[PDB]
Amino acid sequence: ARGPKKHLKRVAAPKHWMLDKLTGVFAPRPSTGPHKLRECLPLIIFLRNRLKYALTGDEVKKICMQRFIKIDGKVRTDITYPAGFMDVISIDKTGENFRLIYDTKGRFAVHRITPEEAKYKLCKVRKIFVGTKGIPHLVTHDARTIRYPDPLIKVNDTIQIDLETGKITDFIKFDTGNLCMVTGGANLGRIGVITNRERHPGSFDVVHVKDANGNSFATRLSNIFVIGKGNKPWISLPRGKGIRLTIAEERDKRLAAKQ
């Protein structure tokens, strides 16, 4: 009304956080940060629902005030911090090293990674521009800006930056044939190779994506996140490997493992 909102109702929360209906009225209400808030997932319900290291909202604070919750190598102490996608957390005492990845049903996945692959993350760029005194800038999927990039890095390119250093290690260019992950719309969580990029001048650009199992589909360009060179991902994938199963094919692969 007269200003910004800082409550959030629980039934108005994003449903891929998988909240309750009767445990309260309110929602965790993620802080302002690098990621938009409909896309993201806060720190509170990641360590009391996704991992069960806590039972109340107070128990998340008294682990996060002991200063070992490391989001992208940095200790962030607010329990409503917006994590987002492709970021590595670091407990560093019991050493879990999760990365936030969607599973093939649109939801963030509890997903461990090795303690040396954790040392980096990947970033789609959202804009490249020249700054003052004529030097190039890029701004990424997250809020992180980089000065002096490799001048082959155009828009909607995916670069790899390491934590604790902050510079670009390897970039991998948005081309037909590369292996993208879709992070938007009704098809997200699926992982497949890019078929073609069919432009629309002035409208939204839509690309077609073939999976590794023939199921072709399409999303618009603002949902595409390249994480592979042709056929191999640069990151560890979860189970399912970005392949959506049908509800009858989910049925027997769920009810035969309960044999």
Place this chain on the structure above:
Amino acid sequence: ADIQTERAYQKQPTIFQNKKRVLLGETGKEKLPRYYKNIGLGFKTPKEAIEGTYIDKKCPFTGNVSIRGRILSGVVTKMKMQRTIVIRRDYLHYIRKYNRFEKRHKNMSVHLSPCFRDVQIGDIVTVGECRPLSKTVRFNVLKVTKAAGTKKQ
């Protein structure tokens, strides 16, 4: 005939006119360099926006207006009102109770740029949109396509 008919000096704010009229630059052959631009989405620039001599802030081809947004089409139904015509876009609205359509319309004021001559009553005009120009004029004329003519006695 002449262009300077208002009470301030009409000119384009970007091109500079008075570039050192000396024994090199003679006043016998005197033009001024004419600023135009190109609109995307495959729209040509009419010859009278390049070899023309007019001045319009609100023209898409020589002013500071940029088309982006919806693109529509209509029929010129009234051509009064200097640099601004009224077009009517008829359409059909479907009432699903009666399983039938309903011939509706709503007309709309658009900025006619003076880079188009043969714009008479009842012609087809594709119209693009931009920032608000007036109280009601939000859209702008891109390309006339003639009707009812090509031979008149």
Place this chain on the structure above:
Amino acid sequence: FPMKQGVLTHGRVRLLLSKGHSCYRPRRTGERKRKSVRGCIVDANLSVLNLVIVKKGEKDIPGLTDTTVPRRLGPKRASRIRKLFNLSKEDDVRQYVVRKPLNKEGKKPRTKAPKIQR
């Protein structure tokens, strides 16, 4: 209603006072409030008037111009303690701070010193 410097009208008027004029201490920031304040000219309609000497003349009025009350809080910032005791330069401010005596009955007699600033 307490008097205000700058009315130049005997009587009682109502001023719209912001933060920092006189006779109005606010309650939240930027609050202005209309209060009835008495003019600066004197009359016979005064319950009390404040009154400040600028010169001692003949003798000692008992209990009014004598019994000099000790300024028990001395200078604390390290530029008025250099100006009070005429410290020339780099004359070790930490040595020449004033120290207040403390004389409670149930406790041992302490002495307190300030921090420093600047």
Place this chain on the structure above:
Amino acid sequence: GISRDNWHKRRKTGGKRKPYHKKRKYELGRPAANTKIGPRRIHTVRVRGGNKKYRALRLDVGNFSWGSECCTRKTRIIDVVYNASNNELVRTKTLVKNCIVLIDSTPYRQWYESHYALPLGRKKGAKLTPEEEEILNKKRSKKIQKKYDERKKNAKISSLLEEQFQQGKLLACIASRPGQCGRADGYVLEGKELEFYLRKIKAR
């Protein structure tokens, strides 16, 4: 409490629209500054964002530009001579944007003399001893006389413009927005533009 919104206007058909909210703060009060010629008074008002705008209650000098020979100098403002938006804003000497302003000629004269070494404004001569006989000769070297005598190509001015270097004051046009930024910059009139406005003052 003067507003600037559209919801008190009668709509396109001609129907009275009934107001559906109170007037809000982002239709903030809009008074005019009416920048006029005197000493320098500038007032500062905070706006949305916490930003400032410097509204110019009274102006003295300007930073007018020359363009054809690329010069910009401070110069004081003499007079307002013609305004297109209102012939009543010129009887009260009020600076607005597209008004034709009148400034003096001293910083442009001493620029034109320090670069070309020609007299300028001069019609009778025979008083040019104190700062004018010295500057055009100065006991230069060889190659300076080479590079200055080749400047008999970009030294001539169209006759409408040096006629008003003679008799004291050049008319110009403000391009800044005083009362909004707090400056009165602009360009010097010249060319077919100057023939336009010299008619529109002569016709008054």
Place this chain on the structure above:
RNA sequence: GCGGGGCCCGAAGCAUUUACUUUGAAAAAAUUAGAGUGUUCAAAGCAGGCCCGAGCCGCCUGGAUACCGCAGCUAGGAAUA
């Protein structure tokens, strides 16, 4: 797009223009329709399930899917009007 040749096909004109139709995107949950689960049953709820021989750093797994009109954005079809 494998200054003048070959397994070669993009940009370009959409050379009447619309209605109509199919496709593909994009469309907040809750609610409905519905998947799973002996809340003891049921309305609900989104939980729960498995052997402790103690290594049980505790293991496995869910929190589906469909429908979101009409108007716009795409690509196709050109009978009918």
Place this chain on the structure above:
RNA sequence: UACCUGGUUGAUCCUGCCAGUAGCAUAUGCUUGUCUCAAAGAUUAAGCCAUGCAUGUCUAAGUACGCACGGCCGGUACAGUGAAACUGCGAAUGGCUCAUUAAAUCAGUUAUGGUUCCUUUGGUCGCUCGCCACUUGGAUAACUGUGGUAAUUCUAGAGCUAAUACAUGCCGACGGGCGCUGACCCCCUUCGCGGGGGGGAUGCGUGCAUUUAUCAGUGGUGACUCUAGAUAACCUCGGGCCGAUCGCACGCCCCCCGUGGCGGCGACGACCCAUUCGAACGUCUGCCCUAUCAACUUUCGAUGGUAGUCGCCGUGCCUACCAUGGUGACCACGGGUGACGGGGAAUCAGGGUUCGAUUCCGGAGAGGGAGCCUGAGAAACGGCUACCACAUCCAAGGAAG
């Protein structure tokens, strides 16, 4: 369950309505043992309200010179705990209501290339050539001590004292480079000559941000008057930044030389860029009843054109000067609404019909109108100022809603 039954006649077949029947939602009547969920002053009065409350807030880290306490560890700056008060930041969210409001709100859609954004992150923060810097200056609260009132979160006077409050302001970088200038180049064509160059003596300007003019055409978009670069200059005293801030473990060089030089983790502020939360303003399409509402709008902006004013920006948003336009039987304009809109709910063959004050999203408003302050954000009401309406205390002077 895509369903019917009784009633005009002496009987008949109809047309027709009436009554029956079934949901669900308000109220009431009678009755009521157990146990799970559970609406609940919406409709008439957005009527009026006694009293009590619902917004406040200290880290190792802005300010302790209250004995309020501490081992006052000792002959001195402060072992810390700390009330009180300054500073900062919130109080613009949430909660309540549905009076207003009929292309308005709202919904989908698409924009801002026409703009604002405390915060959050992530960048930038020796790019400026210029007799305190080992730290400048003046107040003020709590406190002490007098007071005035019938009475309020009323405060007056005098004495102290602090800053991340309120200001002024510097070192180092800093050696210079660059361009505009510019007293010797004489080696070139001194043959009478015309010379071809680099150079020095010289004085200016020099970063970002702001404002205007000009020039060229790194990085982009479908598309610029974009981003960047070049030149000429501005820089508002109610004046743009270029750290006079506070904790923690203390360590290193010590050749001037046992006093001077250097260092790790932070915490705060900080112009500007981008992000985030948005907010605002636009586009397209979509709304119930009424003609016993057929012409409306334009002196008072009604539609458009120029030029400007202010506004955070687009714009009759305003002002001046012009043109005479705009809308309408494809329902304008006016009226009514037991009209907040939507997701939705009841119903159940299909087509539909009715309800939706009500927990979710959006809007609106705090008795009725209006005007403002503070702040990033308010025309705020558990903020202020005034009028209108209602209403409280009074010692009748005034106070507070």
